[PDB]
Amino acid sequence: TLKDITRRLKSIKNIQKITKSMKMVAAAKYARAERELKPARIYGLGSLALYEKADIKGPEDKKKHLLIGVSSDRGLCGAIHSSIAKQMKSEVATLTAAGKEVMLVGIGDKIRGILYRTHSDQFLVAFKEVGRKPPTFGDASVIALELLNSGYEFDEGSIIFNKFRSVISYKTEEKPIFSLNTVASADSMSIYDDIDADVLQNYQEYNLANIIYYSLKESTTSEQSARMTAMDNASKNASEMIDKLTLTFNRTRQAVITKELIEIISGAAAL
Amino acid sequence: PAPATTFAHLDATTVLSRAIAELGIYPAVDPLDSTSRIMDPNIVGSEHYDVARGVQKILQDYKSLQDIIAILGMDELSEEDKLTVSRARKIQRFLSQPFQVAEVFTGHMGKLVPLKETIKGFQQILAGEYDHLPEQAFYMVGPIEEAVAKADKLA
Amino acid sequence: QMSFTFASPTQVFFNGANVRQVDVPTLTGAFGILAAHVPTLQVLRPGLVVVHAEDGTTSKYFVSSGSIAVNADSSVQLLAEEAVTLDMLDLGAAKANLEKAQAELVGTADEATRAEIQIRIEANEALVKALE
Numbered sequence A: 001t002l003k004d005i006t007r008r009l010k011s012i013k014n015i016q017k018i019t020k021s022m023k024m025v026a027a028a029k030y031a032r033a034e035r036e037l038k039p040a041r042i043y044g045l046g047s048l049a050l051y052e053k054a055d056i057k058g059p060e061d062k063k064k065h066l067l068i069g070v071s072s073d074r075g076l077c078g079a080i081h082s083s084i085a086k087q088m089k090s091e092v093a094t095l096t097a098a099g100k101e102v103m104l105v106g107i108g109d110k111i112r113g114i115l116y117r118t119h120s121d122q123f124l125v126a127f128k129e130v131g132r133k134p135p136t137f138g139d140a141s142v143i144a145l146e147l148l149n150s151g152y153e154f155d156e157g158s159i160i161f162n163k164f165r166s167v168i169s170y171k172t173e174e175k176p177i178f179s180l181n182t183v184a185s186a187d188s189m190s191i192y193d194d195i196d197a198d199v200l201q202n203y204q205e206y207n208l209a210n211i212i213y214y215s216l217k218e219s220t221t222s223e224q225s226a227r228m229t230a231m232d233n234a235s236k237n238a239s240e241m242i243d244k245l246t247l248t249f250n251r252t253r254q255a256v257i258t259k260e261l262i263e264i265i266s267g268a269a270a271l
Numbered sequence B: 001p002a003p004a005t006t007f008a009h010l011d012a013t014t015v016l017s018r019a020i021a022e023l024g025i026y027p028a029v030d031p032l033d034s035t036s037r038i039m040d041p042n043i044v045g046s047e048h049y050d051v052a053r054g055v056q057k058i059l060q061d062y063k064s065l066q067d068i069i070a071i072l073g074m075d076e077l078s079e080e081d082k083l084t085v086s087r088a089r090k091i092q093r094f095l096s097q098p099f100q101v102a103e104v105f106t107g108h109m110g111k112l113v114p115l116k117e118t119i120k121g122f123q124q125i126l127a128g129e130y131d132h133l134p135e136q137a138f139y140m141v142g143p144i145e146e147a148v149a150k151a152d153k154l155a
Numbered sequence C: 001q002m003s004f005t006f007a008s009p010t011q012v013f014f015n016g017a018n019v020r021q022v023d024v025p026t027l028t029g030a031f032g033i034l035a036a037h038v039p040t041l042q043v044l045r046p047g048l049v050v051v052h053a054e055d056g057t058t059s060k061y062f063v064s065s066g067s068i069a070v071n072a073d074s075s076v077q078l079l080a081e082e083a084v085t086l087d088m089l090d091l092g093a094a095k096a097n098l099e100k101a102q103a104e105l106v107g108t109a110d111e112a113t114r115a116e117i118q119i120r121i122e123a124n125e126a127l128v129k130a131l132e
Helices: A002-030 A037-054 A080-097 A109-116 A137-148 A180-185 A187-191 A197-268 B002-009 B041-071 B079-095 B115-126 B144-153 C091-107 C111-131
Strands: A065-070 A102-107 A125-127 A156-164 A170-178 C003-008 C017-026 C029-034 C040-043 C047-053 C058-063 C066-070 C075-080 C083-085
Touching: A002 A197, A002 B041, A037 A170, A037 A197, A037 C003, A037 C066, A037 C075, A065 A080, A065 A109, A065 A197, A080 A102, A080 A109, A080 A156, A080 A170, A080 A197, A102 A109, A102 A197, A109 A125, A125 A137, A137 A197, A156 A197, A170 A197, A180 A187, A180 A197, A197 B041, A197 C040, A197 C066, B041 B079, B041 B115, B079 B115, B115 B144, C003 C047, C017 C040, C017 C075, C047 C111, C058 C075, C091 C111
Parallel strands: A065 A102, A065 A156, A102 A125, C003 C075
Antiparallel strands: A156 A170, C003 C017, C017 C029, C017 C047, C040 C066, C047 C058, C058 C083, C066 C075
16 A cells, blocks of 8 residues: 555665664764773773783682673663673583682673573672763772672682774773782792782782773773674665565555556546 | 355354465465354363364464564574564464375375374473474474484484 | 883873873872883872973873882883873862861771871872872
8 A cells, every 4th residue: 555655765765764863872982982992992992011021720620610701781782792692601601511600790781681681590690770871980990899799709700891803893802800819829929029928918809800801891882893894784684675665665555556447448438 | 255155154164275285285274264153162172162262372483583583683682582482383384284085186185183192192282392303303293202203313 | 312101091182102201299208200210019099290391391190009110121110090281170169179188097996997097198198299
């Protein structure tokens, strides 16, 4: 029907321009997402450079484990929250295979909703309000606070985020997170000076907050880029659907004209 | 006017559709347009009725999701919605069946699925008892036994 | 020989630079860091940070907390949570905050909030003294 065809075509046009607007907004946020990465990237990598140089390997003999996974509260990103979900699931499987008591923490409503059903017992704390605003160190400090004030001393841990590679490419990465006893007992830490359990504890906590901030600043850029690309694809899909509907509309329009003409000429030829 | 006039004269209608035959499904019956006067729980039994209605409902929900899935990707759905989509595609494939007279231009062996096997297979697919096999396992098989046998042959 | 990397969550002051000496206010005392320094890692308390460039000029920042780390390869990474250049501050606000915190201290009684208050007081004292 011509009228219902126009209705459906208007619906698809509406959501098509919606995704166009959302894509341009996502690109506008990818701007200032890629800028605030470079200083934050330098900062986070400078934090990690110690663990890298001293070459700490963590213990492979202990069980209590923490799994932090970074995502956002907004959807339409594409394969972001799914990727984090799959990585966290695979690693929970692998670790619980070795009987390691694993606990979970989710930065973002989406990852928490995706992992809460199948993984509810293995769960300590989640977080919301992440994704609307560009993340800042205050957020990471709050998260570190909440993680330390949890009554759960993780002997090892790992954070999983989406290392932003390019506007089209992102790699789900996983950084390690050691505990006080790890860095303390690490024999390669014997060459570091004025070191005792208190200083190492303070430095451990501060590096935890640092790496959470770094993961956040990477994941937000990755997510903005992914949302841009996904909305672009959705706009092209809706455009193709609009072309199909236009073909069908022209067909129905011709049919209606012919039918009305037949009605006229048959009502006139009966005289 | 001709088929729309014939509809009133029939006790059971089977409406083949081109949108389904072009999916490779055969027979191309439209599951959401075929009706029968004996699809009644007091005739075919409450079990058959519940199974048939569940199949129709899940296929109708997938048909409703069609446009979202087409435009806004597949991975923007709810987990329950992805469950229904997967199950509905499995049911779509399973509803197809090779014919003994269609083995001349297809090669496959024609099957004749008894009623009990059909009711059981659709009970099981509805209950998600096969959400691990690929949907491709159900395309053009006989009963559900051949479905799982193929799914094992898939590796 | 000294590869310095002074950074803040939002800003990079130095990066791979070549300075001669950096003075940091570690929580376990102040100390200086020149090339080939013994490898160590420390956490900071609110204080000045004077970075001496090869030429001889000195850049005097102020950091509220963070972490210094000097490694075997004379590669120093100093991350500071809030690294403000000394001009963006003032003495009156610092002194007033110091008074408020001292008053809350002499008013408070519980160890947790008392320690919080004393930390605030420490930050403000370091502020006033470090400015002028």
